[PDB]
Design a protein around this ligand. Structure first.
Ligand code: URA
Ligand code: SF4
Length: 206
């Protein structure tokens, strides 16, 4: 059942966000500081979904406020997407992490399929409340939550997809995770940013 028993019968994002602070749907609530719900309004045409809040998001209470958020904003700007048209969230709402002695941060640990399924009720409540025209899936974790554990983003990036089992039959565009555009050689990171901007343009045009 996961988080399903904790999700209230309401589409109000403020009430949903408050209830998510009380969620015990998986074990991630324990070590995490707080729940990081999505940001934006129900008028949004474009929903974007990442994997999970990171270290800054965990303490800031908001999604994409770190370096990946900076690179996403750089790409949204290049695709002329207004953030007024955006509801932005993640597949899990609790930071899963570890600490490496001598590190400068708490390190994100990849969510399990069990944690992603436990938390999908919140993502369904968000899609039901926002009724997006298009869902942008940022990375493998977010894309598998809605397209299956077998889905490969590398093979389907920038394709307009539609699955019948998804609420509202919104179009789905899967793309690379913005954190991937931080690591690597200059011209690959640049090629990768250009691919992200194309994927955002496809979604803005849906
Ligand atoms: O997937 C991610 C990574 C960083 N911050 C988020 O909000 N989501
Ligand atoms: S990660 Fe999702 S399911 Fe698990 S406790 Fe947090 S809100 Fe509930």
């Amino acid at each position: 059942a996961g988080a399903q028993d904790f999700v209230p019968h309401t589409a109000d994002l403020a009430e949903l966000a408050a209830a998510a602070g009380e969620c015990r749907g998986c074990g991630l609530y324990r070590d995490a500081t707080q729940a990081v719900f999505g940001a934006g309004g129900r008028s949004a045409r474009i929903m974007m979904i990442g994997e999970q809040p990171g270290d800054k998001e965990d303490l800031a209470g908001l999604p994409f406020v770190g370096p990946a958020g900076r690179l996403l904003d750089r790409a949204l700007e290049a695709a002329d997407i207004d953030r007024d048209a955006l509801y932005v969230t993640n597949a899990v709402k609790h930071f899963k992490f570890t600490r490496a002695a001598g590190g400068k941060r708490r390190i994100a640990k990849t969510p399990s399929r069990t944690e992603v399924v436990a938390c999908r009720p919140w993502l369904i409540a968000e899609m039901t409340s926002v009724e997006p025209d298009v869902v942008v899936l940022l990375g493998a974790t977010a894309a598998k939550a809605l397209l299956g554990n077998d889905f490969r983003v590398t093979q389907h990036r920038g394709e307009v997809l539609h699955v019948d089992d998804v609420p509202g039959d919104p179009a789905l565009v899967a793309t690379v995770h913005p954190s991937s555009l931080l690591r690597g050689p200059k011209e690959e990171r640049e090629s990768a940013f250009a691919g992200l901007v194309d994927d955002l343009r496809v979604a803005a045009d849906v």
